[PDB]
Amino acid sequence: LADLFPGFGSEWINTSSGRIFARVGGDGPPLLLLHGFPQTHVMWHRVAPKLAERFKVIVADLPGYGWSDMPESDEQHTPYTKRAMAKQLIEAMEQLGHVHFALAGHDRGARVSYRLALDSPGRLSKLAVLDILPTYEYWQRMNRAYALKIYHWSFLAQPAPLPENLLGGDPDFYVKAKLASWTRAGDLSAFDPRAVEHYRIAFADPMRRHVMCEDYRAGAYADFEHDKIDVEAGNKIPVPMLALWGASGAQTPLDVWRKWASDVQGAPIESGNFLPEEAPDQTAEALVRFFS
Amino acid sequence: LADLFPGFGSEWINTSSGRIFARVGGDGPPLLLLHGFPQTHVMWHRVAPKLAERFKVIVADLPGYGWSDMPESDEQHTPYTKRAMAKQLIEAMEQLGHVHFALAGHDRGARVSYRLALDSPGRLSKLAVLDILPTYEYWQRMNRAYALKIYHWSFLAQPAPLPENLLGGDPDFYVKAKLASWTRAGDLSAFDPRAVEHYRIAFADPMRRHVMCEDYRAGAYADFEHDKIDVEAGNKIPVPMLALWGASGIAQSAATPLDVWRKWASDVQGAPIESGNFLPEEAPDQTAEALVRFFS
Ligand SMILES: [Cl-]
């Protein structure tokens, strides 16, 4: 497996729920980057160096993902709820002495990120979310068209062992097909082959796949219920926010986030749903300018 | 594989879209029975003998299912649309000299049946649909709760080869889990083990699994569009109709099925029966009685 982060160290960070793995580089104000599904921290390999010019950049594997430990789940999928993941990553950041930091997330990591901002806004100076709407909004939008487009939200959330059993027959094909399907190009050409190998190796492990299903089960149930409480309470994120999204993938995303946050700017980028790899120069530029 | 219709004949019926396999028994008015997913004609084995006491019973494998031929599909999934399946089965019935007949369908076969009644009502004396609402009605109900409870409508409709690839690793496990999960009890006890082996063997063929995926792809697209045209036009089935459904099945999930069917048909009756989604196997005496009384 290739080292795709020149000048970055490798850290295992202890928490009460298990170790969080991170690549760490740069100096200056602290910036945490959180990947999503079906990827690992290495999805930031194209943009993290530009960020590390100006920030101390911490590129973490989500709880249960990549090389992070996998806490044992339960009947409500608790450690893979975004609330729980946010609490664990707040603990990890405290181990480094970071109790107020900047945060950017993509996909599931962006879900952790806006949940973190709702639950513990004092932890964040600035927030970026990439290629997402709140989990509540996806579910509110779930008609025939959406059930077909984002079928994996219901499929991966089916009670165990249904998706686990299916995913084990040929995991390489499934993860490579998802990676390609969600890009503008519809193939693997936006990715570094070395990064695809990281994703494939992670996805090849049945325990790692079970975590992903627990993540989507949380997304269908507890995450949705947490979001619903905020909607009903009229809670809006007060942290300055940036919403970025691939125009060919979230997509009016800024209209949606304005209902969820009181200080948000945003922009589409010509890309599918893997912005930091499909449009790394654009994405890095927007993030550097926002966080500075 | 076992003979579950002892005494019944067999036919391999030619049509422009491929052969239809059927077991044929009894004597009297013609009655066609159409199975669904993930099953074959043998799911009628517990009610078919009783019906054969009063009707000429034709127990057919759906186009692409069981031992019927599997036509090559196309970009619109045409031969596995319920419109096309109904045309094909109309041809098959004509080969037998049946141009006006009674019809009962279950699950996908019931979808073929109500589409048949919408496109070609003159072909049916009476119609029974088991364990279903119209395809349009399931999609209209699509929200979070529904998407989570009936995931396979969207899963199996994903573009090929995604579900085919997933189902190929351990097909026995998936189909046996579907059969058990959709029964009242949640196990395989409602089935004759010999019938389960018919279902398992069919599902073990990748070409048969591909057909099933095409069926659900049609169900997500062309079948839905066909249904949408009829309900937006206010078209109702004029053929006298019976709707039966298992109380624990998904046709009675977020709907009162008879009220749904009254939107689609101008002369409909029906009733729930205590059962999951496999009425003719889970509640055979009750199902057989309802059908005999209705078609008589
Ligand atoms: Cl998604």
mmCIF file of C-alpha atoms in Angstrom, chain A residues 113-235:
data_model
loop_
_atom_site.group_PDB
_atom_site.id
_atom_site.type_symbol
_atom_site.label_atom_id
_atom_site.label_comp_id
_atom_site.label_asym_id
_atom_site.label_seq_id
_atom_site.Cartn_x
_atom_site.Cartn_y
_atom_site.Cartn_z
ATOM 1 C CA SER A 113 -19.243 16.863 10.675
ATOM 2 C CA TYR A 114 -22.630 18.630 10.593
ATOM 3 C CA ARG A 115 -23.856 16.421 13.510
ATOM 4 C CA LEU A 116 -20.725 17.488 15.434
ATOM 5 C CA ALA A 117 -21.555 21.129 14.711
ATOM 6 C CA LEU A 118 -25.188 20.645 15.869
ATOM 7 C CA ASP A 119 -24.169 18.836 19.054
ATOM 8 C CA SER A 120 -20.982 20.687 20.052
ATOM 9 C CA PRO A 121 -20.680 23.941 18.048
ATOM 10 C CA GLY A 122 -18.070 25.282 20.472
ATOM 11 C CA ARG A 123 -15.645 22.739 19.063
ATOM 12 C CA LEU A 124 -15.574 24.280 15.619
ATOM 13 C CA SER A 125 -14.172 27.497 14.225
ATOM 14 C CA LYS A 126 -15.361 26.788 10.652
ATOM 15 C CA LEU A 127 -17.154 23.859 8.959
ATOM 16 C CA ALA A 128 -17.061 22.538 5.381
ATOM 17 C CA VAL A 129 -19.379 19.854 4.040
ATOM 18 C CA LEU A 130 -18.808 18.215 0.661
ATOM 19 C CA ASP A 131 -21.219 16.341 -1.653
ATOM 20 C CA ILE A 132 -24.019 16.081 0.891
ATOM 21 C CA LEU A 133 -27.382 17.262 2.232
ATOM 22 C CA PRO A 134 -28.429 16.381 5.811
ATOM 23 C CA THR A 135 -29.522 12.796 6.262
ATOM 24 C CA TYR A 136 -33.023 14.036 7.210
ATOM 25 C CA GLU A 137 -33.342 15.808 3.845
ATOM 26 C CA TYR A 138 -32.401 12.729 1.807
ATOM 27 C CA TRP A 139 -35.006 10.715 3.623
ATOM 28 C CA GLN A 140 -37.662 13.410 3.248
ATOM 29 C CA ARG A 141 -36.936 13.327 -0.482
ATOM 30 C CA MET A 142 -37.294 9.522 -0.726
ATOM 31 C CA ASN A 143 -39.807 8.977 -3.511
ATOM 32 C CA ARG A 144 -39.610 6.536 -6.437
ATOM 33 C CA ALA A 145 -36.903 8.555 -8.165
ATOM 34 C CA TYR A 146 -34.730 8.835 -5.076
ATOM 35 C CA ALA A 147 -35.297 5.250 -3.958
ATOM 36 C CA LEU A 148 -33.871 4.187 -7.328
ATOM 37 C CA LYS A 149 -31.004 6.749 -7.363
ATOM 38 C CA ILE A 150 -29.782 6.133 -3.823
ATOM 39 C CA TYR A 151 -30.900 2.522 -3.393
ATOM 40 C CA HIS A 152 -27.882 1.777 -1.167
ATOM 41 C CA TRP A 153 -29.460 3.877 1.666
ATOM 42 C CA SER A 154 -32.140 1.229 2.036
ATOM 43 C CA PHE A 155 -30.125 -1.804 0.839
ATOM 44 C CA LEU A 156 -27.152 -1.439 3.193
ATOM 45 C CA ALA A 157 -29.636 -0.663 6.017
ATOM 46 C CA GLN A 158 -31.454 -3.986 5.725
ATOM 47 C CA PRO A 159 -31.068 -6.091 8.884
ATOM 48 C CA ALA A 160 -27.916 -8.186 9.084
ATOM 49 C CA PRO A 161 -26.802 -10.503 7.493
ATOM 50 C CA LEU A 162 -28.604 -9.654 4.195
ATOM 51 C CA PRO A 163 -26.254 -7.067 2.788
ATOM 52 C CA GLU A 164 -23.173 -8.585 4.428
ATOM 53 C CA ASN A 165 -23.946 -11.942 2.864
ATOM 54 C CA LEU A 166 -24.404 -10.423 -0.608
ATOM 55 C CA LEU A 167 -21.319 -8.203 -0.414
ATOM 56 C CA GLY A 168 -19.030 -11.158 0.379
ATOM 57 C CA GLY A 169 -19.403 -12.891 -2.972
ATOM 58 C CA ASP A 170 -17.367 -10.317 -4.905
ATOM 59 C CA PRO A 171 -16.504 -7.250 -2.786
ATOM 60 C CA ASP A 172 -13.912 -5.964 -5.306
ATOM 61 C CA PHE A 173 -16.522 -5.595 -8.002
ATOM 62 C CA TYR A 174 -19.053 -3.811 -5.799
ATOM 63 C CA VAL A 175 -16.672 -1.186 -4.356
ATOM 64 C CA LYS A 176 -15.103 -0.493 -7.742
ATOM 65 C CA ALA A 177 -18.522 -0.143 -9.295
ATOM 66 C CA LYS A 178 -19.657 2.385 -6.651
ATOM 67 C CA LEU A 179 -16.447 4.388 -7.075
ATOM 68 C CA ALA A 180 -16.974 4.576 -10.835
ATOM 69 C CA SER A 181 -20.750 5.061 -10.778
ATOM 70 C CA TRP A 182 -20.633 8.150 -8.595
ATOM 71 C CA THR A 183 -18.036 10.014 -10.704
ATOM 72 C CA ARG A 184 -18.912 12.259 -13.622
ATOM 73 C CA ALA A 185 -16.800 10.021 -15.933
ATOM 74 C CA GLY A 186 -18.550 6.815 -14.843
ATOM 75 C CA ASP A 187 -15.273 4.974 -14.660
ATOM 76 C CA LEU A 188 -12.202 4.885 -12.369
ATOM 77 C CA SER A 189 -10.166 7.446 -14.280
ATOM 78 C CA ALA A 190 -10.612 10.274 -11.711
ATOM 79 C CA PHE A 191 -8.861 8.161 -9.077
ATOM 80 C CA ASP A 192 -5.207 7.410 -8.451
ATOM 81 C CA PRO A 193 -4.895 3.616 -8.861
ATOM 82 C CA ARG A 194 -2.963 3.544 -5.580
ATOM 83 C CA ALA A 195 -5.934 5.123 -3.802
ATOM 84 C CA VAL A 196 -8.365 2.661 -5.411
ATOM 85 C CA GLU A 197 -6.180 -0.127 -3.998
ATOM 86 C CA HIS A 198 -6.504 1.360 -0.492
ATOM 87 C CA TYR A 199 -10.334 1.409 -0.871
ATOM 88 C CA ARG A 200 -10.376 -2.099 -2.310
ATOM 89 C CA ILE A 201 -8.224 -3.555 0.446
ATOM 90 C CA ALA A 202 -10.420 -1.965 3.126
ATOM 91 C CA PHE A 203 -13.591 -3.215 1.438
ATOM 92 C CA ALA A 204 -12.163 -6.721 1.068
ATOM 93 C CA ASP A 205 -12.383 -7.266 4.853
ATOM 94 C CA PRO A 206 -15.779 -8.581 6.001
ATOM 95 C CA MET A 207 -15.501 -6.781 9.386
ATOM 96 C CA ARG A 208 -14.957 -3.499 7.597
ATOM 97 C CA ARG A 209 -17.968 -4.130 5.377
ATOM 98 C CA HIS A 210 -20.092 -4.891 8.431
ATOM 99 C CA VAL A 211 -19.120 -1.477 9.845
ATOM 100 C CA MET A 212 -20.278 0.195 6.633
ATOM 101 C CA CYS A 213 -23.624 -1.511 6.928
ATOM 102 C CA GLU A 214 -23.892 -0.424 10.587
ATOM 103 C CA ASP A 215 -23.142 3.133 9.402
ATOM 104 C CA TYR A 216 -26.044 3.002 6.887
ATOM 105 C CA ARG A 217 -28.302 1.327 9.465
ATOM 106 C CA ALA A 218 -27.542 4.245 11.831
ATOM 107 C CA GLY A 219 -28.303 6.535 8.889
ATOM 108 C CA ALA A 220 -31.762 5.047 8.421
ATOM 109 C CA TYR A 221 -32.681 5.134 12.088
ATOM 110 C CA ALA A 222 -30.860 6.971 14.926
ATOM 111 C CA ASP A 223 -29.162 9.534 12.632
ATOM 112 C CA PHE A 224 -32.520 10.321 11.047
ATOM 113 C CA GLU A 225 -34.182 10.656 14.462
ATOM 114 C CA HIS A 226 -31.402 12.995 15.711
ATOM 115 C CA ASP A 227 -31.757 15.189 12.652
ATOM 116 C CA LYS A 228 -35.562 15.238 13.005
ATOM 117 C CA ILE A 229 -35.287 16.604 16.567
ATOM 118 C CA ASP A 230 -33.158 19.508 15.323
ATOM 119 C CA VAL A 231 -35.569 20.245 12.444
ATOM 120 C CA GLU A 232 -38.512 20.334 14.832
ATOM 121 C CA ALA A 233 -36.622 22.505 17.355
ATOM 122 C CA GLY A 234 -35.596 24.865 14.573
ATOM 123 C CA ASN A 235 -31.918 24.373 15.463
#
